[PDB]
Amino acid sequence: DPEATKARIFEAAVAEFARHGIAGARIDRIAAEARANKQLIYAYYGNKGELFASVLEKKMLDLAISVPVDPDDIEGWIDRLLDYHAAHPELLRLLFWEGMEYGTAELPHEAERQEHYARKVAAVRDGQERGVITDAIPAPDLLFLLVAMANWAVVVPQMKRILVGGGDAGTDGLRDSIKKAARRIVDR
Amino acid sequence: EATKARIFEAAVAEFARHGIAGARIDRIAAEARANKQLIYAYYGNKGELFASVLEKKMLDLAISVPVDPDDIEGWIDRLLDYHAAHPELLRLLFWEGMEYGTAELPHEAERQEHYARKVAAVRDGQERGVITDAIPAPDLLFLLVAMANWAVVVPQMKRILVGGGDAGTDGLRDSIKKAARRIVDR
């Protein structure tokens, strides 16, 4: 299973995209690392852009299935989200490279990305309609801001380290602040 | 318009698009119309060059928009305005985070003081009871900054979620302020 060519390319692609981004990624390196010929990569994914889009989409589905947005347990959702990122740092890294490469332009799998968010937003909205979470802020914006506080530390680990100190006492302390902040934001 | 100024500018542009490891001194020299040796004469080495360039952009923002506990919403407005007008800062900060991770920074001491000052401004606001103290000053500053800057890290998520163009940008702005208030309100 993990020996299948498609699986090897997938994994090598992740590693390569994670380090060098989309433009800096080298198909040759991916091929070498996957012990697969360059033509095989194109046979399974068509082109570099499609390959990145596919790899990213899969990691996102994994997180979406493992940690669905849950308005009835904001704190538990935050805990699971933080745990996942710590256990799988490739996702956020790929997301950053994508943001840098495409900026505000349409994405290769634009439609699929739209649905991805429409579902998460719906989970937030449902919580608003049921009055479990504030509706002072729109559902999408609300989801975005909660995600911002949970992932910011990954973007600037030097800022986190210097502001809350290294060591578990800081990570854990921060996790606690994120949850207290999320509560104040969604309450009522 | 001296050469040190040209190198600085070229360095910014270079670091902004290629990061620290991917940055090329030759490119910076060519773009600055300055010999490679001159860059080392004025900044010593690539790492020192980056640290100097980043430190300067941060001092600029720090002086232009001080952490103000007595006007969190105005502070957020000015913060958002500044990043939109000077996108190099956040970009450089991301590259730095990716390059050093959790390791000591070249100008570690200077960075420490930088944050100690911002933290102090939030603390002061807590001590005066203008801002909640349910959350520690440092963490409080961090979370506020997170909401303000996350959109620049993932422009695609912002665009899809709150809409692109001025409508989306202005809507997120309002939400950021409302969220910040709920977080700090004593």
Q: Give the contacts of A38 (CB within 8 A, at least 6 positions apart).
A: A27, A28, A31
Q: Strand, helix or coil at A55?
A: helix
Those residues whose C-beta lies under 8 Å from the C-beta of residue A93, and which sit 6 or more positions away, are A18
Q: In the structure encoding, which two tokens stand for residue A35, read together?
A: 């012990």
Residue of A nearest to B104 (CA): A158
Say if residues A166 and B138 touch (Cβ distance below 8 Å): no
Residue A137: closest CA among B110, B176, B139: B176
B19 interface with A at CB cutoff 8 Å: no
For chain A, give percent helix, strand, coil, nearest 5.
Answer: 75, 0, 25
* Dihedral angle computed from the Cα positions of residues A40, A105, A138 and A143, in that order, rounded to the nearest 10 degrees: 30
Q: Which of A155, A183, A160 has its CA nearest to residue A171?
A: A160
Left if phi > 0, otherwise alpha if psi is -120 to 50, otherwise beta: which for B86? beta
Segment (H or E) for A140? helix A139-155
B91: nearest CA partner in chain A: A100
Domain count, chain A: 1
d(CA A128, CA A137): 10
d(C-alpha A183, C-alpha B55), whole Å: 35
CA separation, residue A77 to residues A63, A81, A147, B141 (Å): 12, 6, 11, 23
Give the list of residues 6+ apart from residue B59 with CB closer than 8 angstroms, or none.
none
Contacting B residues, span 118-137, partner chain A, CB-CB under 8 Å: 119, 134-136
**Residue B136: what are its φ and ψ, rounded to 5°?**
-60, 145
Q: What is d(CA A5, CA B33) in angstroms, rounded to the nearest whole number?
A: 49
Q: How many residues are there in chain B?
A: 186
Q: Whats the size of chain A, residue-wise?
A: 188
Question: In this structure, which amino acid lies at residue A80?
Answer: R
| Neighbour tally for A174: CB within 10 Å | 23
Q: State how far the Cα of A144 lies from the Cα of A131, in Å rounded to an integer.
A: 19
- With beta carbons less than 8 A apart as the criterion, state whether A116 and B154 touch: no
Residue of A115, A149, A176, A183 best to disrupt the B interface, most CBs of B under 10 A? A149
- Which of A24, A96, A174 comes nearest B139 by C-beta? A174
| Closest by Cβ to A155, choosing from B102, B153, B161 | B153
Supply the CATH number for residue A94's domain: 1.10.357.10
Q: Closest Cα to residue A83, out of A146, A151, A17, A18?
A: A151
Nearest to B172 by CA among B161, B181, B156: B161
| Way the structure was solved | X-ray
* Secondary structure, 3-state, chain B: CCHHHHHHHHHHHHHHHHCCCCCCHHHHHHHHCCCHHHHHHHHCCHHHHHHHHHHHHHHHHHHHCCCCHHHHHHHHHHHHHHHHHCCHHHHHHHHHHHHHCCCCCCCHHHHHHHHHHHHHHHHHHHHCCCCCCCCCHHHHHHHHHHHHHHHHHCHHHHHHHHCCHHHHHHHHHHHHHHHHHHHHCC
Q: Are B143 and A181 in contact (CB under 8 A)?
A: yes
Residues B181, B103: Cα–Cα separation, whole Å? 33
CA distance B7 to B53: 10
Closest to B110 in 3D by CA, of B43, B59, B35, B44: B59
Specified resolution (Å): 2.3
CA distances from A172 to A9, A78, A84, B49, B126 (A): 36, 13, 15, 34, 22
* Beta carbons of B155 and A24 less than 8 Å apart: no
**Beta carbons within 8 Å of B108's beta carbon, 6+ residues apart:** none
Do residues A41 and A87 make contact, with C-beta atoms less than 8 angstroms apart?
A: no
DSSP assignments along A12-46, one per residue: HHHHHHHHHTTTS--HHHHHHHHT--HHHHHHHHS
Listed by number, the residues of chain A in 66-105 with a beta carbon closer than 8 Å to a beta carbon of chain B are 95-96, 98-99, 102-104
Name chain A contacts of B182, Cβ cutoff 8 Å: 136, 184-185, 187
Token pair of A125, please? Answer: 């909205």
Residue A160 domain boundaries:
1-188
Distance CA B91, CA B97 (A): 10
